[PDB]
Amino acid sequence: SAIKPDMKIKLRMEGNVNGHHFVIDGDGTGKPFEGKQSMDLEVKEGGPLPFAFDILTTAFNRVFAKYPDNIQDYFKQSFPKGYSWERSLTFEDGGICNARNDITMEGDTFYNKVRFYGTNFPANGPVMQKKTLKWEPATEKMYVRDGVLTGDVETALLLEGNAHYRCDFRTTYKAKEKGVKLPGAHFVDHCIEILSHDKDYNKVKLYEHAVAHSGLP
């Protein structure tokens, strides 16, 4: 196994939300076999961000997922060469994001090249007015569509005032190695949490826990 029980994470995100440009660096560690990761994020350019930091957090690696023996782990079998993903986020008020990550490994470290583009957020909506509190825990549905591993999530951001803001995720995942076998359909339960932040979310500590399962107890 190329993947050790303790791995480091290095990340750079560039992107643009409603025309606002930004650059964010990440430094973290995780336990690929326990499904756990955490990381310190720092806004390097375009701070303070004029939108809700929460829209970005799922773009800051399904290698950090606890897979049982009875499900093919596409993510861990993709290393050392790595894999990339492409994701569409569709919000109920017409806000749309496209994100991608190209993930490589050098020794004990995953390197992440992240791009994030958002548009059509209404100026009076909760993203641009910074009204989000968190992502609700969710279940990703994994399946194969036209020979490509696909993950679907239907989930929501909790807002101030006991409201939810609905988002649909679709992610496609591709190994760089031709010949990594596709898994069968399955689920990934995940929970993402901001553990701490400073006044304008220029510095954020982010945590994710993910577990794969076949949908029974």
Side-chain angles (χ1 to χ4, degrees), residues 129-147:
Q129 292 293 330
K130 293 177 191 184
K131 303 298 280 176
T132 72
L133 290 184
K134 65 171 173 192
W135 289 105
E136 295 290 7
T139 300
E140 183 172 17
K141 287 168 178 195
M142 302 281 208
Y143 61 88
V144 179
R145 179 180 159 158
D146 202 13

Side-chain angles (χ1 to χ4, degrees), residues 79-96:
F79 292 90
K81 230 154 158 59
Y83 79 100
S84 64
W85 57 250
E86 296 199 74
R87 184 172 299 155
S88 65
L89 287 79
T90 305
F91 293 89
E92 56 172 80
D93 63 351
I96 179 78

Side-chain angles (χ1 to χ4, degrees), residues 174-195:
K174 295 182 202 206
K176 295 177 213 284
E177 202 89 285
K178 302 98 170 304
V180 174
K181 292 271 297 192
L182 294 170
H186 65 276
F187 309 97
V188 180
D189 285 353
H190 67 280
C191 181
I192 187 161
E193 188 181 350
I194 293 172
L195 294 185

Side-chain angles (χ1 to χ4, degrees), residues 10-188:
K10 293 290 207 291
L11 180 140
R12 172 158 286 191
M13 175 182 276
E14 310 190 10
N16 187 303
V17 171
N18 272 28
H20 302 282
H21 178 253
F22 61 83
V23 175
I24 305 176
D25 280 348
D27 180 0
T29 66
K31 286 165 182 304
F33 296 105
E34 292 182 36
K36 296 185 170 176
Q37 59 184 128
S38 56
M39 60 184 82
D40 295 304
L41 306 165
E42 179 163 11
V43 178
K44 291 312 182 73
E45 294 192 14
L49 297 182
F51 57 84
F53 196 88
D54 286 314
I55 67 162
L56 303 172
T57 51
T58 74
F60 297 121
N61 182 358
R62 280 281 188 249
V63 81
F64 297 104
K66 189 181 185 293
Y67 267 80
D69 300 317
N70 65 329
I71 303 162
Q72 168 67 353
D73 191 339
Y74 192 76
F75 303 108
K76 293 191 187 58
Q77 289 296 307
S78 292
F79 292 90
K81 230 154 158 59
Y83 79 100
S84 64
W85 57 250
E86 296 199 74
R87 184 172 299 155
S88 65
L89 287 79
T90 305
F91 293 89
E92 56 172 80
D93 63 351
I96 179 78
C97 300
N98 298 292
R100 52 198 188 251
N101 192 5
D102 305 293
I103 306 159
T104 56
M105 181 183 79
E106 310 284 351
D108 61 344
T109 302
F110 295 111
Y111 285 89
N112 297 254
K113 183 189 210 222
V114 192
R115 303 290 181 268
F116 191 106
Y117 303 111
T119 194
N120 205 232
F121 287 102
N124 61 351
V127 168
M128 292 319 294
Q129 292 293 330
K130 293 177 191 184
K131 303 298 280 176
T132 72
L133 290 184
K134 65 171 173 192
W135 289 105
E136 295 290 7
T139 300
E140 183 172 17
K141 287 168 178 195
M142 302 281 208
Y143 61 88
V144 179
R145 179 180 159 158
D146 202 13
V148 172
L149 178 60
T150 305
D152 285 351
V153 183
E154 299 186 12
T155 190
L157 283 154
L158 179 63
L159 302 191
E160 278 172 47
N162 304 334
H164 279 98
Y165 176 55
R166 278 275 289 97
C167 185
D168 295 337
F169 295 36
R170 173 161 298 156
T171 310
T172 61
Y173 304 96
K174 295 182 202 206
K176 295 177 213 284
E177 202 89 285
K178 302 98 170 304
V180 174
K181 292 271 297 192
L182 294 170
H186 65 276
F187 309 97
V188 180

